[PDB]
Amino acid sequence: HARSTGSYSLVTQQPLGGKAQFGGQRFGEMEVWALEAYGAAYTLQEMLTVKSDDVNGRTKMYKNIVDGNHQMEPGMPESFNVLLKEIRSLGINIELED
């Protein structure tokens, strides 16, 4: 089974589960430690942002791969926005400072 792109999940915008739902392989926690043990910071970053969750970023990635330009413009993964909205639904004020 293989996918380039396809259907994404509803709450988190990550790809769906398995080859019946056209899949996407879980790049889980131990594989993230594998890419952190190498210095593969960009491979890791594109596994996090523009392959799962960066909704404005994965469409840009597709249009850049198609237009011959292998470059990413990563933003914030939508799961982190789900997390900031779920922590704020408890009585807790979590923020992003600058």
Partner: protein, 136 residues
């Protein structure tokens, strides 16, 4: 996870005194596979004194370890990350060699994840009167 090699040298002079692991009557790890790849913390000198066998801040690669077993030096003070003066990280000299490449480690290596994986990878291979001198 957050331990990264962030410096080239903290200039410290501390370090652990590496010796061979002798459990009772027999050796279990020689000095060679214990100091190979470390940097020395002090000048290693021959049993005949006043001539430094290995200089102070030297990386002990295989030629230097062959020099340490030509002579009979059995205790080498090496530099360790537990005695690194670097705050928020570890210097590249107190770590030593990057075991996967064979040279001194680069600045930026994520050594804590490598250490944690290297310890917990063999985890599935684990489970669940008078003295008589043996030789001369």
């Amino acid at each position: 996870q957050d331990l990264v090699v962030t410096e080239d040298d903290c200039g410290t002079h501390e370090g652990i005194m590496m010796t061979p692991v002798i459990e009772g009557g027999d050796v279990k790890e020689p000095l060679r596979d214990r100091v190979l790849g470390r940097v020395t913390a002090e000048d290693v000198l021959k049993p005949g004194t006043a001539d430094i066998l290995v200089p102070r801040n030297t990386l002990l690669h295989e030629q230097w370890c062959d020099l340490l077993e030509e002579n009979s030096v059995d205790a080498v003070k090496v530099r360790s990350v537990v005695s690194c003066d670097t705050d928020f990280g570890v210097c590249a000299h107190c770590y030593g060699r990057d075991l996967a490449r064979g040279h001194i480690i680069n600045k930026g290596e994520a050594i804590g994840v490598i250490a944690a994986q290297s310890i917990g990878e063999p985890g599935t291979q684990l489970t669940m009167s008078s003295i008589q001198v043996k030789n001369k």
